[model samples]
Target chain A: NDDIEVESDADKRAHHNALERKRRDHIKDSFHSLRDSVPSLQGEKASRAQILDKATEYIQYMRRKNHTHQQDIDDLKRQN
Target chain B: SDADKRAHHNALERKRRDHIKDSFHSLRDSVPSLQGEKASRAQILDKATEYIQYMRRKNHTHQQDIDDLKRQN
Candidate 1:
């Protein structure tokens, strides 16, 4: 009885490993596409760390602008 | 033959869904600020789109500024 149970468990583990590989590969492909969409990083070989860093910088540079600072400057210039 | 065709159709469908999920996961991971900031898939795509638009506009405005400065000089 114990031997049969162990065999069944082994079979389950094999199937789990197969599914895990597919999941990992799917995740890797996802990152690849994301990096490709990033204009600065596109067509350039970049590590995951580099991709993340560049993406953060790109997002920040854009977000930091279009705020009250630009609006205020425009308003003052218009007043003058 | 029919069974074989059905099996192939299912395989293609599976791959299509896998690729779609991969894209969502990738976009979710790309946003650094979103790390530890729990958000749904909808939120992830929304923020990413907003950021892309913002960057495009900022670039356009900066280019105009540069051109104006050059004209003054």
Candidate 2:
């Protein structure tokens, strides 16, 4: 007989649900941290989706700035 | 059996907290200026937002300069 013989499923599932709940709460906290990361929304409020949208735009802005930086450096260096 | 179940649950919780902590650290490292700076969670969030704003402004100023130079050249 193996040691993996727990016929009663009650305690096992109870622990499982409790652990899952803890993770859900922690995930919400992480999202809250992300929302507060944005200055426009720090003192204000935002839904999870909105916070994600803002972060996405922030990343996009960074990308465009790099492109501009590259072109400008070339713009000056090519002076003849 | 009950005690064994509880022990496993607690061990999982401990690992979860550590994983969460490490995930936040990973995010901070992704930012160039704050890499390994041991920034507070709020500090890292705010600085990243602020830095993005700065880059946008600086990019515009440089683009303006380039605009004029291109016309002159």
Candidate 3:
């Protein structure tokens, strides 16, 4: 049972919306704190938006790279 | 049966308040910066909820605390 509404349904939705927005802001803050502490990233301090975009790209790149490596290993095993 | 219903409602309300307090505590723990924030998240939530409930109750009780108070009078 969802026993957690402090008000009517509409008011509860507004409260949940506010909390969701706040949660996102807090997540971004944590990311910024970590990024700021890293000293070696020279030039072009990335915004949260920029970093997030690049994070997606890097994940995709890593996935493709891993797949290629696995294929090469499989091919070598087959040759042996 | 009416008394039992009221008791159940009161128990549910208390549980809700306790959950709200737990939420604020967790927020403070998770967001260290929240430690410095003046009011706890629970406090802020309670204030907002109380205001909404008060306004709703007032409108029901007096039926005239509208935007135009003069007209309400």
Candidate 4:
């Protein structure tokens, strides 16, 4: 009975470790994809820190671009 | 004995949570758009997801336009 209990505990630990590994891999892959999508990161190998920096820069640039376009449209409408 | 086990389990759990929290911070710091904005974790993820989708769509549309122009010529 004791041996069976020990085996069960080992199996549980193994299962838990596998799940954690899978979770970590998924998160890591997501980080990789985010790194790839940022144009500033293109042709450059970026660390996670750099990836985050570029991602934020790209997003901010896009936001500003959008705002400028919206302002332009608003101005054109007002003039019309 | 039970107290020792509980302590060990709690320590491991705390470390695991800390690792996840650290990752989120890294993710938050990565985005420049997020600067000067106080966003919760959920908000950060939402904004990042939106930005990624926008990029993908822009790329697709831009490629299509290029292809169309090439075909026109």
Top model by DockQ, which number?
A: 2
Worst 10 residues of 2 chain A by lDDT: A1-10
Deviation from native of the Cα of residue B46 in model 1, angstroms = 11
Q: Which is the winner by lDDT between candidate 1 and candidate 4?
A: 4
Model 3 CAPRI rating = incorrect
lDDT of 4 at A66: 58
- For candidate 1, give the DockQ: 0.06
Per-residue lDDT of candidate 3, residues A37-75 (tens digit): 322322348754443333333334444655665565455
User: Against the unseen true structure, what C-alpha lDDT does each candidate score?
Assistant: 0.63, 0.66, 0.48, 0.66
Q: Give me the runs in candidate 2 sitting further than 4 Å from their true place.
A: A1-45, A48-57, B1-27
lDDT of 2 by residue, B1-73 (tens): 9999999999998886676566556546555778768776556555555665566577667777777777777
Look at candidate 2 and tell me the lDDT of residue B49: 57
Query: If both were scored by TM-score, which would come out higher, candidate 1 or candidate 3?
Result: 1
TM per candidate comes to 0.45, 0.45, 0.30, 0.53
lDDT of 1 by residue, A1-80 (tens): 68646677778888789988986776566556546656788867986555545555566665575464466456555654
